[PDB]
Amino acid sequence: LEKFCNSTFWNSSFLDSPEADLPLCFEQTVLVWIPLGFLWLLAPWQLLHVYKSRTKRSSTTKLYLAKQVFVGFLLILAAIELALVLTEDSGQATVPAVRYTNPSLYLGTWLLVLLIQYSRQWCVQKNSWFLSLFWILSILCGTFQFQTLIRTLLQGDNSNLAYSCLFFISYGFQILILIFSAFSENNESSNNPSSIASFLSSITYSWYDSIILKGYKRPLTLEDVWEVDEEMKTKTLVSKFETHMKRELQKARRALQRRQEKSSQQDVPKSWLMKALFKTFYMVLLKSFLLKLVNDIFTFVSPQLLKLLISFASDRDTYLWIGYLCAILLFTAALIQSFCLQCYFQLCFKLGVKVRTAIMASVYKKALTLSNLARKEYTVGETVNLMSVDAQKLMDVTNFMHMLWSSVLQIVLSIFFLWRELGPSVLAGVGVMVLVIPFVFQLTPVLVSVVTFSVYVLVDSNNILDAQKAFTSITLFNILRFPLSMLPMMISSMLQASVSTERLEKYLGGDDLDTSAIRHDCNFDKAMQFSEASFTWEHDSEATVRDVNLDIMAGQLVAVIGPVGSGKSSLISAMLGEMENVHGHITIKGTTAYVPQQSWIQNGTIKDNILFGTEFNEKRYQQVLEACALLPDLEMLPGGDLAEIGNLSGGQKQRISLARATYQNLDIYLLDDPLSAVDAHVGKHIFNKVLGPNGLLKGKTRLLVTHSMHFLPQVDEIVVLGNGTIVEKGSYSALLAKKGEFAKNLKTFLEYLQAIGLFSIFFIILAFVMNSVAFIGSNLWLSAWTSDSKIFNSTDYPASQRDMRVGVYGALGLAQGIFVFIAHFWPQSLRSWITCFLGIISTLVMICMATPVFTIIVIPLGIIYVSVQMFYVSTSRQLRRLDSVTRSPIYSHFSETVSGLPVIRAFEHQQRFLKHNEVRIDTNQKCVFSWITSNRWLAIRLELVGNLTVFFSALMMVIYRDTLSGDTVGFVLSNALNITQTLNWLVRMTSEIETN
């Protein structure tokens, strides 16, 4: 496009000297074609996605107009640019074509920035990712046209003041239109601020700034914590795991059974839980791996740029431009990392919390419908664990899942890099580090080098250690301390999973209850019927009850009289569906109320249970309380109805059970041994009061198993139970008058510092301090050995001299370690903090060793770290007490539902019980999404303090490049490309003590 501007495009000489300037045609061709492209090509997508998801318009607000006028004024500065380029049309020159269009497409592009700003009126996140990067990519390609334009005018040439001024003003407020996008949209209606923040408060996680402040001022409460968004609510999540689970469980079943028969063409589905969770969260893993890959690729830019600065700093000859296009290119690649890593981190932690919730809820739901034979294997404690331990450990594995694919690309690439520099001696170092994976982590940095370096020069006679090859290899080694460290826990965690992905492939995959034999009926003329059917307690044994064909007409009190062991208890259990069907069918009418034999009082207060889900109508609540004679009992109780049955007496637990059903007033009172231990007097009335002719349920149809005959005379239609079949059916007097079987049945009538000791500590402090100097000792030596590289190149180094260099550096490797062993040996929660504290300070003292100016700017960064930590420790401390508060209730209820599954399946209140958990889990999700956001917050701030020490330290070097050395530049900028890492392991360290 040479003719297009009529001016040079990439003449290389332009960058060959001080006063190096990009050619103008490029500054206005591939430096403006790149941002406009991002918007003009990718947006048609982002125009429709809002359209299809169109909703009710939000109110017009000034920021919405200020943003929609400034793009407008910019349409005016652009319009006037073309206007003049066009108005002096007769300049006697064919207009350079580039002159016309750079403003022309500016007009259209800015008019499109309008609708896009307008459409976002209709949405929850007003300032998107698209219009927060169209600026960050046209207010950074601009600095090149802006640096050139100021230059010509400074040099006195005033050929063009039109373009100059117009472009200055246009770039003028793009540093502002954007400054406006980020001001958090101020809509406050959304309880969760998160769904309302602009791209730049999400990527810096400041929408969570409020909670942090609220915490410092006063105690936080469950309400202050916000609401988990709808996509993480238990009801929505379970629905999506279930469609996938069912599609896989069955296909796995078919293959297992079918291939079993196919073995002769003439078990539990092998695997599905791991496969099924995946078919569901398919995309929180294809948009969480991609960030990790870029997090690594950028990771490998910083240590290949601690070589360009070192190379210029060694030759004072190189142009001063290189020094300022490196310290800046390092910040653009330390922030791009800090943002990517933390963002991918929260995505995967969120995947983890979602899977935990889904699995826990499904494990509960299933419990309400598992075949009794299957339920037999577990006990109360082991049923809960399938929620408490096995789901949690399918939670911790997802967080570390992507380490496997990445941790081999952070150990293959780190080796390709070290070996490209030091040499085939590189493998040796990886060999010491690898022997290290099976304090040791603290020591490896000192050692790996002594081994790679000492051997490098000694193995051969033609190689010496330069500083473009020693302070770069240190960094490359450090970028591999991490993957090696995560391989020990990771292969343990991805192997504890095989136990859980199997145990939970058994409860979730178990056989269901079978209810074909009992058919619920509303038309049987007889209220309850038995069809000579048989039911078996064991899986296939001779039925305990068989051939019982008794149909009961409504409103008859039937007492299933039987001698002990005659099969009586099972009859009642049978109608509900508990025992397996040997043969026949039993039909019952309407709802039922299984007062049980064993006591199931649910946790809570007595009054609430008696309701078990209804209003306080005194006409019934008082009368049911009154008749069931729980009245004297409540008065004895200490707190009244609010007394909580966590203290109940055995006799009383029996009483609530009767009332709990008396109130519901359901149609058939299948009652088993209801008056097991009531004193006879209370019982006598109760039989009349609620199960007999004179009492609350005089009308109701009741069946009563009787091992006691105290109220036997008024039993309406007594039945004598034989072994497995009903011996006879008769009224009490008729059997008595007959006196045949019945006569025989009747016949059977600074404080801590003191604890160690301050002097023990003064010695401990004297023991601790030298460890820091040692670090300074070795690093200074490598500066010295690399210093010799300049002096001995023609011919070669004295053999004594190399022998000296290896030797002292060798002692320095041993001493730092000897001090480090003594320091660590002479619980560790205190020890880790100090070693880390001095280490950043060690990097800092050296930074002062080459430039004194830094001491002025250290205290300003130093207060920011005191502050971002001082607040986060408090908010996070109180956002975790709450996490425990919410967890224990959900891990309990699963107990109460299981121990009580017999009544919950009789009263038929299943669905209320199911949603008494979706709420209990959702309240715990909000405490975990907060703790997580808090940790993904303290990181973005602490990384800024850290990327600052590199940028402000690198600049002092490029400025004072005539006094400083050619390898000092390295020791300072190679112990400062590491502060980012140590700072990370520090607040986690101080805060854990903060918990103590």
In the annotated binding site, the residues are 562-569
Tell me if 474 sits within 8 A of 421, measured CB to CB: no
Taking each helix axis from N to C end, the angle separating 481-503 and 426-436, rounded to the nearest 10 degrees, works out to 40
The residues, ordered by sequence, that sit 6+ positions from 77 with a Cβ below 8 Å of its Cβ are 166, 169, 170
CA distance 194 to 868: 21
Identify the residue whose tokens are 């109320």. Answer: 593
Taking each helix axis from N to C end, the angle separating 440-459 and 799-825, rounded to the nearest 10 degrees, works out to 170
Q: Is 162 helix (H, G, I), strand (E, B) or coil?
A: helix
Q: Rounded to 5 degrees, what angle do the CA atoms 854, 855, 857 make?
A: 65
> Within a 10 A sphere around the Cβ of 678, how many other Cβ atoms?
19
Q: From the annotation, which residues make up the binding site for ATP?
A: 562-569
CA distance 558 to 668: 12
> Within a 10 A sphere around the Cβ of 729, how many other Cβ atoms?
14
Q: Alpha carbon of 530 to those of 539, 566, 932: distances in Å?
A: 21, 17, 58
CA distance 306 to 327: 10
For the record, the structure tokens of 420 come out as 């490209």
CA distance 147 to 137: 16
Nearest to 780 by CA among 938, 923, 975: 975
Q: Alpha carbon of 979 to those of 308, 724, 774, 842: distances in Å?
A: 20, 80, 18, 10
Q: Is 551 helix (H, G, I), strand (E, B) or coil?
A: strand
CA distance 839 to 846: 11
290 Cα distance to chain centroid: 18
Tell me if 978 sits within 8 A of 340, measured CB to CB: no
Torsion of CA 803, 804, 810, 811, to 10 degrees: 140
Tell me if 403 sits within 8 A of 486, measured CB to CB: yes
Tell me if 299 sits within 8 A of 480, measured CB to CB: no
Tell me if 660 sits within 8 A of 585, measured CB to CB: no
Tell me if 9 sits within 8 A of 26, measured CB to CB: yes
The residues, ordered by sequence, that sit 6+ positions from 53 with a Cβ below 8 Å of its Cβ are 123
Tell me if 897 sits within 8 A of 367, measured CB to CB: yes
CA distance 758 to 756: 7
CA distance 994 to 873: 8
Q: Which amino acid is at 954?
A: A
